Symmetry: C2
Subunit: 329 residues, 2 copies
């Protein structure tokens, strides 16, 4: 655990499209801004689930690719400064006796005058390996997210899963690692067929249809035991690193432990976007009210409403109504 003692004006929970636009508007209102995001990148459901698909119902865009919209939002918010904390899932939020919010994640403790939660359906997290003692190896040689390929240089690597993530990493590691195995529970892969063709074409050891049965290693994982899906046959692999790419899940989880009023598995808001905790606002798919629609356009409307009301909360002489952007730049 570490601690960032700087009190930010606005801390945003979740860097999907609504959080990104919220960050922009915080900058517009001369607020210091932190974004905390569960995944190793920004973009929420758009970047995670349909980055290549076209969106037709965002105002002003006859058609726009999801990732393109996210890229536009990043460019928009780049005019201002934020501190962005990726791979952090907020698990605790408490308004302290001095009014300052304290936020705790899996990695770091943060402070803020206001919090705006833009969590969607809750934190995106990788699917964990469902083997009794898998957690023991987290922080050692069990990897869920991969960034630096060179740490696997000259090493025996096993990758679990059959999607684009598992296949892509297997192909990138083949020329770097001593040996690479990919283990998937069907003979048919879920990854793009061309990537799967290259995989079979490559020197990657493909083990299908198998599931992980056991992890062995007192300290570091040393052996991986596989079991065939149809039948009882087992295989043991000697490995230096295990990468698990089983996709992602989202849930509210600890968002329900902060004293917020929750209805429809979402955070209730007044028309100002404020929750039942003053200084704590919500926007986008995480929020609810009578007539709420879960759309990007709706969230993009909620964002400035939240930021502008947050600004008035922080500075009772600040007008909720912003000045014209046409004049300000």
């Amino acid at each position: 655990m570490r601690e960032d003692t700087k009190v930010y004006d606005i801390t945003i929970i979740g860097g999907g499209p609504v959080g990104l636009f919220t960050a922009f508007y915080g900058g517009m209102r001369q607020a210091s801004v932190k974004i905390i995001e569960s995944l190793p990148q920004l973009g929420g459901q758009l970047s995670a689930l349909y980055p290549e698909k076209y969106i037709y119902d965002v105002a002003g865009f006859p058609k726009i690719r999801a990732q393109e919209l996210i890229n536009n939002l990043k460019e928009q918010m780049a005019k201002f400064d934020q501190t962005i904390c990726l791979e952090q899932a907020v698990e605790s939020v408490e308004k302290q006796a001095d009014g300052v919010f304290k936020l705790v994640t899996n990695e770091e403790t943060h402070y803020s005058k206001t919090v705006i939660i833009t969590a969607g359906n809750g934190a995106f997290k990788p699917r964990k390996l469902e083997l009794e003692n898998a957690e023991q190896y987290e922080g050692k040689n069990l990897h869920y997210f991969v960034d630096d390929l060179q740490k696997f240089a000259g090493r025996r690597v096993a990758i679990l899963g059959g999607g684009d993530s598992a296949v892509d990493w297997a192909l990138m590691l083949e020329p770097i690692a001593k040996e690479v195995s990919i283990i998937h529970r069907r003979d048919k892969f879920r990854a793009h067929e061309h990537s799967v063709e290259n995989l079979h074409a490559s020197k990657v050891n493909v083990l299908t249809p198998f599931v992980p049965a056991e992890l062995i290693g007192e300290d570091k994982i040393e052996q991986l035991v596989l079991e065939e899906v149809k039948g009882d046959r087992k295989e043991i692999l000697e490995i230096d690193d295990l990468i698990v790419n089983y996709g992602f899940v989202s849930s509210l989880g600890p968002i329900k432990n902060w004293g917020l009023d929750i209805e429809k598995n979402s955070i209730v808001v007044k028309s100002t976007m404020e929750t039942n905790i003053e200084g704590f606002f919500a926007a986008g798919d995480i929020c609810t009210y009578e007539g709420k629609v879960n759309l990007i356009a709706s969230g993009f409307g909620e964002a400035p409403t939240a930021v502008n009301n947050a600004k008035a909360y922080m500075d009772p002489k600040a007008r909720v109504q912003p000045l014209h952007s046409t004049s300000l730049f």
Copy 2:
């Protein structure tokens, strides 16, 4: 007075940016849509009051010219069918005994299952010439809205006003008209400095500081008499056409007589965007609620909220939540 006996699903009062996106969204939800707009053009405050200016706080646009955003919205809604009624200001809205809304304008009577008012600050009207016989010439050779500039080819034109609209028309007409004069009540123009420099360098006859004194003509205007401001001098122009560019005025006007709940020139809405009259919704600058900010982004979020709740009102079996646009097309 004429009557359109077709009962529309959704009829939108005002074709500013929020009414345009509302109209698009109606199409998205497979509703029959009519837009009724007071001016001879769509675009609201953007097109009328700042078409040339860059907007920076619409989600997904690092910067977009106001008129270009309007153009984008028109392209977006062109995917579906709408009935557009320009040059019609709504004077009366009544929810009849059968539940059907009856809307009466200056030109026509309309019917609708639901109404979504997107009127901003009220119906735009051009500021008119305050001379006693001026109205007599409307529909003849006195012009408040100019579309077919070619019809001024080879003609003697006088333009009234000192803003960008007047100056732009003078400069655009100079190369094709026989003669162009611009008449303004101060030696200083309100138009942009470079345009004014172009104006003085051109062959346009600039008459300042003058106001119109008299229109002469039994049928069409044949002569325009001007008088110097704070002076003792008149001028008479022989003209074929008179264009007046005195800007725009807006007010709620008869919107206050429909039995709606109104505060501070705004229609009070609950979180569903519904007014106190069931089936009658509002969005954009016209609506209010605690925390409301008059922004384009805000209005763009309110629009689909209104449409989707109007859909649920018309068919309580149909859902509020739309299917994905990524999927629908």
